[PDB]
Amino acid sequence: SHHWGYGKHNGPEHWHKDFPIAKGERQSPVDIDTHTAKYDPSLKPLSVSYDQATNLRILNNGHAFNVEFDDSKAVLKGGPLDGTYRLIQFHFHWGSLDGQGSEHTVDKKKYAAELHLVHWNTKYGDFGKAVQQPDGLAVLGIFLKVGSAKPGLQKVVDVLDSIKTKGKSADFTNFDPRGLLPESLDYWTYPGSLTTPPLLECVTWIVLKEPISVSSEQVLKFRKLNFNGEGEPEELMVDNWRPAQPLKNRQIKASFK
Ligand SMILES: CC(=O)Nc1nnc(S(N)(=O)=O)s1
Numbered sequence: 343s344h345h346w347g348y349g350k351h352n353g354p355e356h357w358h359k360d361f362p363i364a365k366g367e368r369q370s371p372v373d374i375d376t377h378t379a380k381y382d383p384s385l386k387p388l389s390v391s392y393d394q395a396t397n398l399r400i401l402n403n404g405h406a407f408n409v410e411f412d413d414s415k416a417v418l419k420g421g422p423l424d425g426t427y428r429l430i431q432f433h434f435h436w437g438s439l440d441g442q443g444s445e446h447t448v449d450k451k452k453y454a455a456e457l458h459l460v461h462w463n464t465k466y467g468d469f470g471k472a473v474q475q476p477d478g479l480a481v482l483g484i485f486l487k488v489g490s491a492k493p494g495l496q497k498v499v500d501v502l503d504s505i506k507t508k509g510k511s512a513d514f515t516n517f518d519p520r521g522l523l524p525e526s527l528d529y530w531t532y533p534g535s536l537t538t539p540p541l542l543e544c545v546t547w548i549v550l551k552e553p554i555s556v557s558s559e560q561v562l563k564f565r566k567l568n569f570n571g572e573g574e575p576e577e578l579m580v581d582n583w584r585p586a587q588p589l590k591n592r593q594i595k596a597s598f599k
């Protein structure tokens with residue numbers, strides 16, 4: 343298949359052929375330069391209102407694994423946002439044993455991995471309408487570094503063996519994303535895009551300053567996933583990140599001095 347991916351023949355340098363907005367003015371990720379990302383006082387503290395979700399789904403879509411929220415609850419408000427944004431899913435980007443694998447960088451420094459909690463603006467009635475609008479999505483990005491285990495990640499890691507290959511999905515119940523947050527909600531924000539096709543410029547990025555620590559054993563489980571489908575040759579799911587994109591006219595703002 344010539345479906346997009348992260349390989350030599352289908353990776354980020356190819357994406358613009360099917361998705362011309364890849365070369366747009368508000369593409370993500372970007373490098374966050376601490377000397378030019380200015381403190382903005384128009385910015386409020388973030389309001390992250392999460393709790394245990396009952397019915398979820400975990401799946402390997404050949405690009406990452408998603409944990410999807412199916413309850414008909416978890417919302418993000420405040421910070422740079424107007425209105426209420428509902429959590430729909432989260433997923434990660436990561437590197438190999440030999441490399442870093444965040445999407446955003448800070449002063450050109452990459453973190454081991456990056457968590458994306460994807461939220462859509464409830465004003466729009468559904469996700470498909472939301473992605474068509476500049477205020478449609480809010481993605482809360484959280485860096486991962488390797489250290490001690492993140493207890494609230496363990497339930498996710500424990501079920502990754504069951505979705506090893508592309509197309510596998512599984513029922514997943516009783517998960518609280520509060521367990522994925524760092525202590526501080528200090529953040530940077532800027533207007534940007536989905537970091538994967540369709541690369542739509544519909545995202546308010548909120549990137550937390552404080553990384554979470556995960557164990558090498560936890561991230562190892564990420565790296566044992568496969569890009570390929572069952573029965574095909576093994577291609578380990580690693581380095582599923584897009585390179586940093588030009589800031590162009592944008593300003594990155596900081597919630598903190
Ligand atoms: C359905 C959905 O959430 N699609 C996404 N595609 N890219 C995303 S990202 N990396 O910008 O968080 S989210």
Ligand SMILES: [Zn+2]
Nearest residue numbers: 345403404405
């Ligand atoms: Zn796809």
Ligand SMILES: [Zn+2]
Nearest residue numbers: 433435458537
């Ligand atoms: Zn992502």
